[PDB]
């Protein structure tokens, strides 16, 4: 499987973008693209050998650590931290079998109990997205708050803010282009900051606008989608024009009509 | 007032693109531009000296004549033949004092008792869009038509056939890209074809798909405009999407909301 590696050491809005630009590029096959928006591969047909991209990450402790995403929603998966890897609990039969493909050379392979979806982890986390500071800072804690994990030295809650924190700066970031961009500023200015309603809406909205998007007459929704601006305030969504500079990719949801 | 030539001597579907590109930047200002399709100036606070355009047409027979568009909507509102000087019967006072400023050095002004809209000029000609062929060789001919009424050489019905098959080959072709295009393949396998569906219900819609999408949400139209196909079928429009190729110019309808 294709890695990208990335550091927080000495890191850079330029090394950011290059990061963020590398992994859309592989996360994409460039096959499908919808109004000017690319679509992830359709889960059905594709082989394991396709199935996976590793993201290696490194802070200024060296301490370094391994993420797998699925390809075909930019999941993160599970992780490597030396001796052993942890898989979030697969929610199908598929899925369990797949990731079975992932970091086969570790001695130790464990598989939570939990899912990695946002409700839960928040719960696990003790705190909400709204909560936790995003910025290079918090990644590199991060990444030595999951290494630490496969020594006895990182908390259960701590270990969940942590996975909060990595999917919202790289998933989130490779879906979209607004969020990557607000990951951006964080790292110019060497600001630390929790997202704002803008940023919470899109995670929250990405499959609907994935479905809208592809499910559109010629590009108008069929029922405008409601989003929140930085300052809270509501906005109705009613065409992907608007969206276009917003979202950098889209999970398959249906074929392109002809 | 900026003046355009074109002649159908040896016409091209280069010479005559080449033609049509010049017209469509002298309608517009490049100021107003919605949804990457160019809007006309708006008729309140347009200065005369900005308010019109000439179009010198010369044939193989050497006859020219000079017609005169109206820059708000691309109509053409009267012509130039040697001598005299027509105008179309203007529908309002506005207008009526605006002509007042063209072919001011003919020694003969005459203003039809008629406009010149597709039905009255129809009703005129005793035949309708549909059965007038379009192509190099009916624009040859109206040019001589349209010369020879200023001595007595043309009857009514062939002056409004003239008028019909100019108003198509220059205003409707600057208006939209697709009418543009169904001219160039007759120039170039030199054929002579009445106009089908799909030519004839995008000329009947421009006002209204100008208003949908000066007025549509993010580019989706509140309620769907229907066209024809060339084979007659119907075909719904909710979107200004597919119409970006279509048209070219839109008549300015409302300012921008912000
Ligand atoms: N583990 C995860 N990977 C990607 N997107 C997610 N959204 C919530 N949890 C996620
Ligand atoms: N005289 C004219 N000029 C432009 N468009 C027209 N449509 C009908 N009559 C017209």
Redesign the interface.
């Known amino acids: 499987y294709p890695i990208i590696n990335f550091t927080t050491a000495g890191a850079t809005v330029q090394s950011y973008t290059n990061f963020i630009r590398a992994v859309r590029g592989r996360l994409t096959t460039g096959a499908d693209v919808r109004?000017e928006i690319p679509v992830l591969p359709n889960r059905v047909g594709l082989p394991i050998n396709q199935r996976f991209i590793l993201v290696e990450l490194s802070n200024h402790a060296e301490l370094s650590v391994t993420l797998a995403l699925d390809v075909t929603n930019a999941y993160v998966v599970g992780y490597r931290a030396g001796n052993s890897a942890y898989f979030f609990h697969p929610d199908n039969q598929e899925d369990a079998e797949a990731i079975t493909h992932l970091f086969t050379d570790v001695q130790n392979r464990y598989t939570f109990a939990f899912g990695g979806n946002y409700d839960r982890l928040e719960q696990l986390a003790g705190n909400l997205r709204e909560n936790i500071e995003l910025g290079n800072g918090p990644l590199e804690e991060a990444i030595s708050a999951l290494y630490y994990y496969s020594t006895g030295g990182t908390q259960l809650p701590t270990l969940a803010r942590s996975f909060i924190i990595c999917i919202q700066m790289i998933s989130e970031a490779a879906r979209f282009q607004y969020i990557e961009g607000e990951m951006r500023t964080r790292i110019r200015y060497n600001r630390r900051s929790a997202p704002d309603p803008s940023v919470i809406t899109l995670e929250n909205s990405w499959g609907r606008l994935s479905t809208a998007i592809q499910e559109?007459?010629?590009?108008?929704?069929a029922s405008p989608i409601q989003l929140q601006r930085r300052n809270g305030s509501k906005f109705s969504?009613?065409?992907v024009?608007?969206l276009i500079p917003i979202i950098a990719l889209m999970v398959y949801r249906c074929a392109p009509p002809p």
């Open positions: 109004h559109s007459n010629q590009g108008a929704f969504v009613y065409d024009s608007i």
